[model samples]
Target: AQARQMESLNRGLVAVKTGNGVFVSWRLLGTEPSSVSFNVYRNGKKLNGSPITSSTNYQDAGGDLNAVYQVRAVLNGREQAPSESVGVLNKQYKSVPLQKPAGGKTPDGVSYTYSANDASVGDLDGDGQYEIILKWDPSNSKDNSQDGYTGDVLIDAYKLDGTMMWRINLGKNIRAGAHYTQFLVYDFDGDGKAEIAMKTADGTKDGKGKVIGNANADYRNAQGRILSGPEYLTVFKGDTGAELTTVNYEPARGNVADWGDSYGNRVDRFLAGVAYLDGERPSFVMARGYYTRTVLVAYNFRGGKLTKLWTFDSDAPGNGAYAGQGNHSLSVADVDGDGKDEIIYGAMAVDHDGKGLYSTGWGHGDAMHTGNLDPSRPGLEVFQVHENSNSPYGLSFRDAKTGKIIWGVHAGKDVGRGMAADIDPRYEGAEVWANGSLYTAKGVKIGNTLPSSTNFGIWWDGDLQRELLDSNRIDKWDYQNSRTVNLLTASGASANNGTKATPSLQADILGDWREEVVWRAEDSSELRIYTTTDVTEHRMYTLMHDAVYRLGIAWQNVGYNQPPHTGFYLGEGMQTPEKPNIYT
Candidate 1:
């Protein structure tokens, strides 16, 4: 009989202390002579520099206080039984407040504290600390009274001291709903102050019982009368929260409607989002959705007036009349990593006749229809600016860039409200997320296919491979069949295996080059670390959930969160410390 010493290190042999960082070491005990290397795992993925000498123990810096760690010994090239596991708490960051007395909620009865609008955190104020930008409806009601255009948009700023800074009411009579509006804060002018971009719709001036007018004309719906032209894009000074400018596109002369008829109404003219090109005087890409056609318009903002750069038509192929409901989404990124950004826009499905009604005033037939997928109609369109043209829309890059019809593979198909991000860890390029699959320009499928009906949220990682990371199912109200949104690696991970949803999904990265996701389940929420490598598997610990909406992760510690519960607050750059309490 072969003598066998202890064959493996028993589990639970190592224990980590709470609130302290510790190094873990393990040795192999075997009767047979073998070459051994030590492997360390946090959460689930193997940590970096793993497989050290069996005698050499690996040291871990202080970890999140609530994370779990395990170590294993690899014999010959395969991993042997894991040694004991360890647990430790590095620090007690901050917890979400349970009540509104501490400036957590708003007085309008809406909980702006824990919302997706606050999902990103940053040092937007350059105050040496991070701040949060909380976006939410002022009316806390859930019914149609505040649905499309009856509520107000508010952005509240908080200081790191947990004190109320200032609250900027964007405008009254605005659309109210989760996911109805999105806010982007960036240094568009390269000034130290950040600028806020808010995307919304202007009411139509048609006399169909509600106010409807030209896409440019503004009118009251209830009175069947015109008031003024609709306002398209509204820019605000990020630091002062003051209105910077507003833009609108009117039909050329002679297209005006009869005094009583709704002929010339710009029924669905809306601005989707803004994209900035890199240059001394960069160009802003605007996706314009008109009732008859969907167009991409580029504007040069340097001369204090929005000057048209180029325009691309969705129906350029002439398959059918091009119509976009102005309710779709747009994104800008350098998908090919060529230092130039391209415009991507989603198109709502069209009927067989190629005619669709505008769903802006009422929520009637606005439900996304998947039946719009046809080989002839293009559901998604990509456009690039020409070096010599001043048109609003750019030329198509189908034949030259990829030598194939970019929209032909899935032409005329509606892929359930798609989103794009650059998530590949290998290429710092952008990827498109649609129909639950991540696609690269090279026609490679990055992540595992999601369930058929599942909708996703995508993020782009530039420092990492242009890996497209996504969240699982869309959040519908029923709550019975829905699982907490899963964090799936469309690309960048192993071939087809999706990373488990342990680390929550984050809306934006605050600081450093790493990415992070903040997740919430029921009442508990936690911030999970994201990396280009497989160091930490999907693991999430408690952070805060009670009233949190958006979470911003920052590398620098801006003093947005101070005294009471110091972490970070949104919009602190424009806040003045004398405003109403944000949490309360």
Candidate 2:
């Protein structure tokens, strides 16, 4: 009779809800005999009085949340029709479009080259499942030459359904110019599983048994050109990269301009936060040089041995050399709730055995976050900046263990992106920028044109409730529809011109605390993803090389569940907060 409504026997059917229960699943067209019995419905109402048997799947668990689900099967008495709706809302916001790696699964001509700064995403082996963590490159391509130096690295670890739980494969001789090249995955030593504080350059076989040191030319690259090895920080084992301990760092002699160093001891810029510094564990702070004469090394590694304890030499004759201290970015927090932790590195500030404690001027080592950001005080605060020398270029909420300052700014004329949180829904934070307006931490401007250097990042606007600023303007503090919502003027053809160090990323896939914005036009090969409750841009994926897609840094609230998001409402800003809005 009714032409058998088979619409390919109910298509694929997805329906998720990995947390408070929903599950659904389906895909059984045709030989449907896993002991069939499907009914399930929600906006058409009929949650279940019993019928979803055997196993193509069904979970649904009652109480009708935001509503709209479906499934149908009756066999014999006949009705297998409707099956394509899924809408369980608590505000609603889910957008997925991932397809950037269809090309070399590997070993065939080997070509991958990506570094959003080595890329990361955690859950390394505690196995609750999250992974990602890359640093690929597989094959001898990095030979920037002085003698061709050593490349072939790998180190993968996928798993977001695309599967790839471990790859490993590193160097043959080491130091092919990725020196201190970071691709982190923390848990450094208090040991709860997760380790991979890796960094290689001029290796001496610590791939397994440890030997390091002996590659010569003595290191120089400030036009004097020479980058000769001697720099390993190894600590693998995130389920099997293996190694687990080896720290060599011995570069400081390039012929002494104060003792040579344009880039020798390898690692130039680095960051892997998780303070507490001593019995507090989690340490790694290396700033190394203008090639020589700006050394900030703070180490940590027990048992298998590799402990330097502490050292800070900005040339050291009273620890000289400042002015954003030869930047390559550096940070180590604690920002004053005390208990240690300080490192910083724009104008200088050190402690936790290396001493120094303060440097006077500042700007552009930018990227420091700790949080609390003025909920009236009692805890966190770091929100940095020194930008073109702030005459009006503002930002600074420092303190984080006495680098002092606690509320600083100049507010405009110049600036480049930074991060902040609480994300304005009354919870506080988020309200900084400078060049075209938008100030609030006392300078009062409340607006945006924000184009100093472009590229932004501080995600959370697909119902993670508030906080969104993907630069060139996506800036939303809609605070549940209160105001401010610019998502790049909806297709003025999306822009962020990349190269402020490529920003814009936020993914939660659907964990529900909300997030999914990963944009990457960077000048067009395209890579977009947006849907934080209608902010738009729901799909577009093409870019194969030559631009930014970056997106990897993770922890996803670890083991899930971080709720509430933020509270206190300082609703106004502009006195320092950048580096993609300083971590929440």
Candidate 3:
């Protein structure tokens, strides 16, 4: 028998050691009523003088690092069960051992080694705590442009205590690369527990060793491209990695050349995410093609089956402008103020009903971010950098809902790298940077040079501004001093994705609404999650409760890795965010 699935009322409690005191935080789940109050306890003694109804975090001024902490909900003058206890340990990070797979040789006799690549988190068992879903990438994995045999890609689930739950192999039929394996980990049925969804192929094997598709079929071409196989979409039970459902992939590879390339490069460009299409429940979104012909389909996975809701294709009637306007990644948010989440697919946006809401026709880009980037604006905004050398604007800021370009800069060149974050307190919202120039939220040039590292943004330190996270170091953009300051460095941990240099994952999984950075050890034997121990005067709900940030974690490993951002303003002098409207 398994443990009973914990409901949303279960407080996700966490405590961290900092400055001889303990900073305790708990989640105010969407299931809990807005009037619910809480009481904190340390070492079996109450710490709060009154019922805490303002926030979900507390700073114990005199608690020890080894002290035990717990939180209990007080609903309508009644005390609920004490939450699962946590302890404030002396260290600021935790190490989780990984089960490294043995290296193997390809059919062409090329040897390759394995390393832990992208990772995401989900409460697989409904225990009010998240488990890690890790993808293992072989050293010789090739891009779609390359022609070669590669080792099978693997996905593994692990508990926080270094216990491996299960593993699924995307066997030889599936090409191994960043563009192929776009997996979505989420609870689509509102069951309080998550399920793993991804693309599958012939010879794929689950944790129980059951084969999918035809076990004896080899669909690989002589160049190792799986262009003729029976492609499948599978949903696996998050607890055991067992197959729950399988269906033929949508918008099938009718003609690889129709996707802008004769080779498999453009056809296999896949990106996945979890979105609330109805403003009440989650749906699994699968997208194919980003260069020329783009198609997106939304599905509902409930009752152990997949129900196709809607499909949007760039080749459809009146949608010709959306072609060649996709990005490596996609964002999910309620941009139209209609209460339903829309997919921000690069320069275009699709309404919740699977129709083209708006298309800027800005062509394609390598990186893009969507959120409340401009607090002065009425709705959300999008900041993106373009790859087209002839476009009038290389980097642009546009309205997220309407796709109207507000401002842009550095035209007539490819802007390969750009990022948005509120690093300076003087700005009203996040600043955008690209091509070695930094601009304010209004697109005004504030500095001549930007931080060299533009991969990810981290909400570290005690201030409202964010910090730069690149390679093995966390740096702060010293705007006033005209230089960058290295804040913290992970001395022995290594970054992933070659020159991209991103972490395995970065999310607000623990204490005090701050984020934690997970990096693989130098030896590739384990993962170390580095958390901030700094104290803060502000109190806010965990960023995971915010719908935009949570979905960002689900798609963080999809295509190009980007840091998650809150739907509301999250910088200097920002207002407190509204309560999230979601379920466990």
Candidate 4:
């Protein structure tokens, strides 16, 4: 008679090499019924082995040293266990300091007091390690009669040892109120020292009692109507935070029906981000938006002067103003993998014209204030640094080496506020994360469309090939019957409330080469992680609150109440495991 059989368990130990060939031991666990065997793999490939039996231990005494390694166990005639992988470098070196706020936690579970005075992180002092910049609300002072707020914007520099290296103060009276600011660290003069670019609320007063212009006088308006604030972009000396130079541009005039009736309703505007081009004398790309016009201005910084390299504008054929605002949704990347970078723009609004009566000499004419054209239709536009005519609104890409349209996709109408990432690990092409939909040039759509209301989706795709994505929507709120009273009732009551949806698609941070689709409904948010390897299916993870703004994923670093806020750039370095290597 055959021997009675029972479920059996298999366990194995493997040795991996660290930086100086120091080997660390690790163990694996699995369930197998028959004779168990073991094999070793380096970077996912099987290594020389004669399926070892009886003893479940192996050593890398003299093999591929300093390389990522993994081990797998087989039971009977089939592979029965998942591969256990580990990074070689980290095991050899001491752990790096955990980035602040390192992991995700229940909303409101942890609270941090951020002094309104100042908080910025970039190379403020020109040293390699990024520094922090902090500022406070100018109006938060005891003296109300003062023209502006007191207390200066402080810049602090620190060395890798977390030691204070130097500090600088921009002085008090920096314009107060809610304004958007950013610090760009780059070699503006090619002098090897990084320079900073900052934008602040311009102080010019308009005839209508509104502040016109940016922090500096770089931008001004002849008409006294309040220009909101002057949008100024300035380059500063990184080491001392000294103002090196500035460029000012007029703010986009809001309420210009021709530009888009709904434009400028959101708080975020102008001077969003900057990108640098590669060359003997690299140029910089600065994006600006008027309530109706979106423009990309290229500047060549030399001898302390900003020479205009070129400018791209998104406007209809007729110069008549239309509601079109540039969201400053732009990115710089080598999408084609050609070793060079290209400029990509996320145009959230498109100018459209509808029949309507203009203001007449006789007070007002018999014209219905019915509605205006919809500008929320989103379109993706690409431009080559060296070629001006390659724009989609202009010419086609036939034969231009330096200048080419490359590709353009009409993602969707009203596809505003989305992010993007490259998900094709096989190098097929790139993917766009917009309006809660994941679309690729290969005709693959992985996620569901967002419900109206909630505009904005942001994501971080972990795979380098397809890494970051996001999107937004305009119809976030709707009335039961398009009635004002119903709208108010819906806003007041949660019962029978209209459904909420997320933007079409964005990138996911998981190890798979697929995009994640997320959405917002009334008061909740849901996320689904998907991969092309299994295009027809997805794994969902729903959150309790509404993430209307942005969503990102980073290593769940231990220690902080919340995980460190690792932006797209910093996340690349943290994807690998440290010790006891486990793949999530």
Give TM-scores for every candidate, taking all chains together and pairing residue i with residue i: 0.45, 0.31, 0.94, 0.39
- lDDT (tens digit, per residue) of candidate 4 on 1-584: 11111111112122334333424232222122224455666554756445643323334444555566565667655654555455543321111111221122212233222122223333434332333332322223212112222233333433323444344333222322222333344455655455555553355221122332433442212221123433455665656655566676423444444334332222233333333333223355554443345555666566887666655555534422322322223333232323233443322211111111111111100000000001111122221111112222211111112222333334223332332223333323333334344444333564444223222222222133322211222111111232111111112112110121222122222222123232222221211122222211111111100011011111010000011111112111223211111111
Decide which is better by TM-score, 1 or 2.
Answer: 1
Candidate 1 on 340-444: residue-level lDDT in tens?
A: 334333222222112221112111011111110111222222322121122121222232212234431332333223332333323223333344454543446
* Top candidate (TM-score): 3
Model 2 lDDT, full chain set: 0.43
TM-score of 2: 0.31
Query: Which of the two, 1 or 4, has more lDDT?
Result: 1
Relative to the true structure, candidate 4 reaches a TM of 0.39
lDDT of each: 0.33, 0.43, 0.85, 0.30
Worst 10 residues of 1 by lDDT: 555-564
**Candidate numbers, best TM-score first, in rank order:** 3, 1, 4, 2
Give the per-residue lDDT of model 3 (tens digit) for 1-584. Answer: 11111225356677777775777776666556667788899986665526475666777877896689888788899988888888876766778899999999988788999999999999899877789899999998888889998899999998878999999999999888888999898887778889999999889999888999789999888887888867899999999999999999998898778777787898999999898887777887999988888999999998878999999998998889888888888999989887788999988899999999988878789889898999999899999999999877799999998888899985788888889999888878999898888999898998687886888999888778998999999999998976889999899898998988989999987656778899999777998888776666655667777778888999999888878988888998798665565544
Candidate number that wins on TM-score, 1 or 3: 3
Q: After superposition, how far is residue 230 of candidate 1 from its true place, in Å?
A: 5.0
